[PDB]
Amino acid sequence: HHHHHVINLKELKILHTSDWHLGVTSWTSSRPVDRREELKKALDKVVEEAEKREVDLILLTGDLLHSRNNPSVVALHDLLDYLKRMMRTAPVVVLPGNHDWKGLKLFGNFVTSISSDITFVMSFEPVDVEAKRGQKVRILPFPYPDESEALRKNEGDFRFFLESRLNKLYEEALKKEDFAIFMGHFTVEGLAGYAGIEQGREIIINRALIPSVVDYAALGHIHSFREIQKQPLTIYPGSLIRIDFGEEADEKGAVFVELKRGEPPRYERIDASPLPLKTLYYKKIDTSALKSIRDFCRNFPGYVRVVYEEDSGILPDLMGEIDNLVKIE
Amino acid sequence: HHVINLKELKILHTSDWHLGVTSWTSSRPVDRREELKKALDKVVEEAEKREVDLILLTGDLLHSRNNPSVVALHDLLDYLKRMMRTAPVVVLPGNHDWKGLKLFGNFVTSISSDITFVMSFEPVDVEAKRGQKVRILPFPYPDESEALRKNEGDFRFFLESRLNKLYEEALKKEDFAIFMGHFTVEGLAGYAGIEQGREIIINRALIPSVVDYAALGHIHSFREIQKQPLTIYPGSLIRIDFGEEADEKGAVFVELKRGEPPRYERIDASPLPLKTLYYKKIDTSALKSIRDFCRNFPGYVRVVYEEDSGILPDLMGEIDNLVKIE
Numbered sequence: 032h033h034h035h036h037v038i039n040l041k042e043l044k045i046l047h048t049s050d051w052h053l054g055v056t057s058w059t060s061s062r063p064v065d066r067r068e069e070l071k072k073a074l075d076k077v078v079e080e081a082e083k084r085e086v087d088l089i090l091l092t093g094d095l096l097h098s099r100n101n102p103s104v105v106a107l108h109d110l111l112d113y114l115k116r117m118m119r120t121a122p123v124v125v126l127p128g129n130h131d132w133k134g135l136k137l138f139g140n141f142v143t144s145i146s147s148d149i150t151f152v153m154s155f156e157p158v159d160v161e162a163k164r165g166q167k168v169r170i171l172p173f174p175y176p177d178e179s180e181a182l183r184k185n186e187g188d189f190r191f192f193l194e195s196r197l198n199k200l201y202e203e204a205l206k207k208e209d210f211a212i213f214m215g216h217f218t219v220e221g222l223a224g225y226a227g228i229e230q231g232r233e234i235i236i237n238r239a240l241i242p243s244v245v246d247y248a249a250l251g252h253i254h255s256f257r258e259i260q261k262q263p264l265t266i267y268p269g270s271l272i273r274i275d276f277g278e279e280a281d282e283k284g285a286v287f288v289e290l291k292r293g294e295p296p297r298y299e300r301i302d303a304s305p306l307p308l309k310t311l312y313y314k315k316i317d318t319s320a321l322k323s324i325r326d327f328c329r330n331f332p333g334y335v336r337v338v339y340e341e342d343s344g345i346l347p348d349l350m351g352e353i354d355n356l357v358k359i360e
Numbered sequence: 361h362h363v364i365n366l367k368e369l370k371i372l373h374t375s376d377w378h379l380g381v382t383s384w385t386s387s388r389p390v391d392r393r394e395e396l397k398k399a400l401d402k403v404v405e406e407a408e409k410r411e412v413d414l415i416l417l418t419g420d421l422l423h424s425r426n427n428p429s430v431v432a433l434h435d436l437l438d439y440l441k442r443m444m445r446t447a448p449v450v451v452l453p454g455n456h457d458w459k460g461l462k463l464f465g466n467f468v469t470s471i472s473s474d475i476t477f478v479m480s481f482e483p484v485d486v487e488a489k490r491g492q493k494v495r496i497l498p499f500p501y502p503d504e505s506e507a508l509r510k511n512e513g514d515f516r517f518f519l520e521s522r523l524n525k526l527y528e529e530a531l532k533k534e535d536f537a538i539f540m541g542h543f544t545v546e547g548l549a550g551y552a553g554i555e556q557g558r559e560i561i562i563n564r565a566l567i568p569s570v571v572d573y574a575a576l577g578h579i580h581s582f583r584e585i586q587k588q589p590l591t592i593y594p595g596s597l598i599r600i601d602f603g604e605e606a607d608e609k610g611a612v613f614v615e616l617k618r619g620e621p622p623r624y625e626r627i628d629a630s631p632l633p634l635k636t637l638y639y640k641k642i643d644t645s646a647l648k649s650i651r652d653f654c655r656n657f658p659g660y661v662r663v664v665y666e667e668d669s670g671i672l673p674d675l676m677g678e679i680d681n682l683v684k685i686e
């Protein structure tokens with residue numbers, strides 16, 4: 032079973048999902064929670080929506096595995112499992128994150144060569160792919176620089192390097208046939224309300240430098256859904272689960288994008304319905320704070336953190352009592 | 361294609377590539393890649409020339425059981441692709457350490473109809489280049505079910521029960537049934553055994569007699585183990601270390617025809633030769649013998665000597681293909 036060929040098809044339906052973080056166990060220093068069941072439920076939801084909408088093309092934009100090092104066998108099994116499920120629905124294009132595995136490019140090249148339903152982009156070189164109904168899509172990829180990031184002493188030369196790669200992708204996008212799609216794995220400059228992860232070693236790109244002649248710019252690396260701009264339509268889908276506290280207010284899920292020649296692109300979010308997070312803050316863990324903690328957590332379907340400033344003696348076994356209390360600090 | 365041409369099957373069977381090996385790293389490292397790729401290219405071109413229907417790979421394709429080098433893994437995936445372009449490929453891996461191998465194997469088998477990884481005792485039905493249906497009966501190294509070895513008696517009974525199961529499954533054949541095994545046949549004539557650390561030994565009579573061909577890997581020399589059923593180790597493609605001076609190295613082309621005995625030809629690798637030179641003492645007459653031998657010898661030379669002979673003249677630094685003195 033391969034791709035249809037529709038004459039004069041000027042429409043393209045896209046599923047764009049990202050930042051799965053397969054394999055993550057959260058709060059290992061306090062109360063480890065294996066996020067696999069929740070994450071697989073969200074991925075199943077995304078797969079089912081993609082099949083229901085009959086998307087033509089599936090875009091994955093990196094950090095699909097939580098560990099930059101060797102992932103667990105179960106994490107790799109899940110990643111490959113869902114790749115197969117997505118390939119069964121529509122051709123898949125994969126822009127991986129900044130993983131350490133030196134064989135990743137080799138694996139990506141190999142599976143790209145042996146299947147017309149998956150493409151790994153791991154360089155700045157454009158790739159022409161065919162979507163489910165025969166649409167020709169020029170992929171303009173922008174991965175984390177291959178330690179050209181570390182191989183640079185100069186901030187000015189590195190920024191010029193990145194801009195020159197963006198300019199080249201712009202030129203290639205002009206040589207488009209039907210559709211052009213930018214795929215990037217980086218941090219957009221000046222993101223409203225981004226922790227920055229106390230920033231060090233990120234790739235920061237000005238959103239105005241993303242080639243404006245692409246039909247859609249699919250970004251990954253950021254855990255919250257963000258519509259970055261409308262021309263070109265530029266989106267981070269977000270992660271599928273709330274990975275840690277700080278992500279209480281994020282929107283989580285994937286995005287369905289519809290492109291039509293001569294018309295503006297339209298999209299819908301596919302919400303993941305993630306479990307919620309809550310941080311409870313107290314001056315002191317007194318009896319009034321204890322009943323607040325116990326009563327809140329008992330009716331809260333997600334995970335709870337408790338923060339308190341002042342010493343309050345030996346606390347009772349709160350976590351033994353409360354199954355969804357994962358951290359006290 | 362579909363013919364079905366269900367009476368004949370042309371097989372290329374090669375094994376034990378040891379991609380990534382550098383030899384004599386403690387004395388004079390020799391990167392074997394250029395010689396090995398030359399042999400692999402020869403095998404590929406022969407497979408294309410004979411228009412084989414099926415390509416069988418039986419393990420130890422990588423030298424390191426640990427994480428292989430990028431260049432070695434690149435070479436492996438490169439030749440897999442070249443072979444897939446010629447005919448469908450069935451891969452029975454050796455005992456590699458990578459815990460992700462089974463996942464990789466499952467994934468690539470699922471996304472391509474031109475390659476199949478067999479990594480358990482489960483039989484797999486595959487289709488050859490001209491539509492022939494081939495039941496693969498695989499026998500890899502026990503999945504550290506070998507480490508699950510309390511008693512030699514219980515372990516051999518486990519191994520024999522798997523062989524019995526493959527025998528029964530081979531009876532459910534349609535066109536051809538092919539055994540693929542990665543192990544050491546018992547009592548191999550002139551096999552060093554590496555003091556048999558962690559080897560799996562199988563009596564050749566226990567290989568299911570109802571298969572049309574039994575493709576074995578793990579042994580570095582070509583061996584016709586028996587004729588019924590035809591059972592072959594192709595050998596490695598290069599002489600990996602001294603001890604393999606007299607081996608035949610290459611691959612094998614096998615032709616099966618139902619109701620006919622199987623036939624095969626060796627595809628010789630033309631490997632570079634190895635030679636060990638022995639002297640009682642390294643005198644000036646022995647040095648000129650060594651120097652003159654190596655000057656006309658197209659392969660790699662080892663010098664062994666019993667008697668103390670003082671500090672050696674620059675024997676190896678002088679001679680580029682003298683790789684070991686011990």
Ligand SMILES: COc1ccc(/C=C2\SC(=S)NC2=O)cc1OC
Binds near residue numbers: 091092125129135
């Ligand atoms: C065969 O093994 C692998 C297959 C795919 C990936 C993908 C990745 S990793 C990341 S971060 N973003 C991605 O899309 C990683 C693999 O090995 C760590």
Ligand SMILES: COc1ccc(/C=C2\SC(=S)NC2=O)cc1OC
Binds near residue numbers: 453458
């Ligand atoms: C994706 O990476 C790999 C792909 C194939 C193999 C095959 C092997 S290894 C062996 S021994 N015999 C074989 O056929 C090993 C890999 O990773 C070490």
Ligand SMILES: [Mg+2]
Binds near residue numbers: 128130252
């Ligand atoms: Mg990353």
Ligand SMILES: [Mg+2]
Binds near residue numbers: 420454456501578
């Ligand atoms: Mg082995």
